[PDB]
Amino acid sequence: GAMNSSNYAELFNNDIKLFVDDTNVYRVTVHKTFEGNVATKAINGCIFTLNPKTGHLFLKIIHTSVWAGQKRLSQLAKWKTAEEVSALVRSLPKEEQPKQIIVTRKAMLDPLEVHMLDFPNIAIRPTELRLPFSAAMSIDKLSDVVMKATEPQMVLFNIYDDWLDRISSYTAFSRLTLLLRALKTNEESAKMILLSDPTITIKSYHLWPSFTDEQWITIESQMRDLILTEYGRKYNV
């Protein structure tokens, strides 16, 4: 059934699996109308579909045109997500299709189950983990490709850069979630930590800076400190 801290290492075994996060599919700015009412303006979104073992990210850009003339958009957004994931599985060769898909939000279970009726052998699972994938749009290069899209588009990334050359997928996933947790809690502080030393650059083909192994320990330390502080402030403890 549900994925939790008791069955954590299952993410890094050799059964192909994908996480699906729909938290950035339907994105709005709320604003006042001339008559003093409130209205929303949609902006481009994305489905965040990630293989936690390999770091392969299937970033499906959701262009604002998909919402034109539709009702109940927060509900449609779950079904559009399920439709695009299902289209992605069908597009993969059989030996690349996932054996499980884990949804970060339980409201995706029925939409995805119904879109995947043709794949009875693919397990659709919820998680009790509070994963920070909502912060994907705090990664500058992902935010850039979403906001510039003029039509629906799939962009492929490796969210771990070249880390798996040096560390395991357990450790790579731990670094990713720490980075995204920090970006979610205090974007400004997190972003300062990552680019404070302009001698460390981001390769054209990468998302994150080119940190040595010792620099990553210092960075990881600074992200934990940031997360703890913000927690003390939040809860006055």
Partner: protein, 300 residues
């Protein structure tokens, strides 16, 4: 008026005939039930005083032959049987009537309860859900499983209810996933009514038979079928006006007849709250909503 004679009553047992029930004592001189209204199906059902487990019974229609009950001390139950000798049977029944050893089907004249619960139920449709083609009557009990329960173990002793599954290729047209899941009208009208049942009467027939098996035998699989068939209609935006009016009457008499003390195990909270308050048909079941609110306001 028809008669179901009993050879004897060798073990203490509560006997039901449709919505009525009588306690019979071990070896009490009891020889059956007379004045059974012609024109309806009937169920005669049993709960032994010594095992309040295994409620069991027999669906029959007196137009289809001469039926009697005889206790089998090997299999330890009251069995329905057919007497093919018309004269032997008339003679058996006349003797027992003359000796007044028979209870009278105690129908009140104003009382349309049994008609209302069995309006669409046909004996030929029961025999296709309960397969034992050598008998004209159908045995059901507490523990019999449905064909849909077996898929998720003896096929010959199963309830062959129509399988309904809201997350099935049968229920969901490719490319109409969200539409078909949130509005089941295509599943109700094309797949189930036009395709499988052929008409609303056969659909209501199975729904009423499922309820009655749930009520009389506490058959859990039957209760699941009854709720599924209600949910399929309430979750369809497009239902013929006459089906909704008839559904409100069907459910009203089912809720009216349920034992007050059984609402906890025979009524599914989610389904009823959905049907009455959330679904497309929330405004369409006035009689059913009024009886449910006055008689089971807790469940909601």
């Amino acid at each position: 008026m028809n008669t179901v004679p009993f050879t004897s009553a060798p073990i203490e047992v509560t006997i039901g005939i449709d919505q009525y029930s009588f306690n019979v004592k071990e070896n009490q001189p009891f020889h059956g039930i007379k004045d059974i209204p012609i024109g309806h199906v009937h169920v005669i059902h049993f709960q032994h005083a010594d095992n309040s487990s295994m409620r069991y019974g027999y669906w029959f229609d007196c137009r289809m032959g001469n039926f009697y009950i005889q206790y089998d001390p090997k299999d330890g139950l009251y069995k329905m049987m057919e007497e093919r000798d018309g004269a032997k049977f008339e003679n058996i029944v006349h003797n027992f009537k003359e000796r007044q050893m028979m209870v009278s089907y105690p129908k009140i004249d104003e009382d349309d309860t049994w008609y209302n619960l069995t309006e669409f139920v046909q004996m030929d449709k029961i025999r296709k859900i309960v397969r034992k083609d050598e008998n004209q009557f159908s045995y059901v009990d507490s523990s019999m499983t449905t064909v849909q329960e077996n898929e998720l173990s003896d096929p010959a002793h199963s309830l062959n209810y129509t399988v309904i599954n809201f997350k099935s290729r049968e229920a969901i047209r490719p490319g109409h996933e969200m539409e078909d899941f949130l509005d089941k009208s295509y599943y109700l009208n094309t797949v189930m009514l036009q395709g499988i049942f052929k008409n609303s009467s056969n659909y209501f027939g199975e729904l009423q038979f499922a309820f009655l098996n749930a009520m009389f035998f506490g058959n859990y699989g039957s209760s699941l079928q009854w709720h599924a068939m209600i949910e399929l209609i309430c979750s369809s935006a497009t239902v013929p006006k006459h089906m909704l009016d008839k559904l409100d009457e069907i459910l009203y008499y089912q809720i009216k007849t349920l034992p007050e003390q059984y609402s906890d195990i025979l009524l599914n909270e989610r389904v009823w709250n959905i049907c009455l308050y959330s679904s497309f048909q929330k405004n369409s079941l006035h009689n059913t909503e009024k009886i449910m609110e006055n008689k089971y306001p807790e469940l909601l």
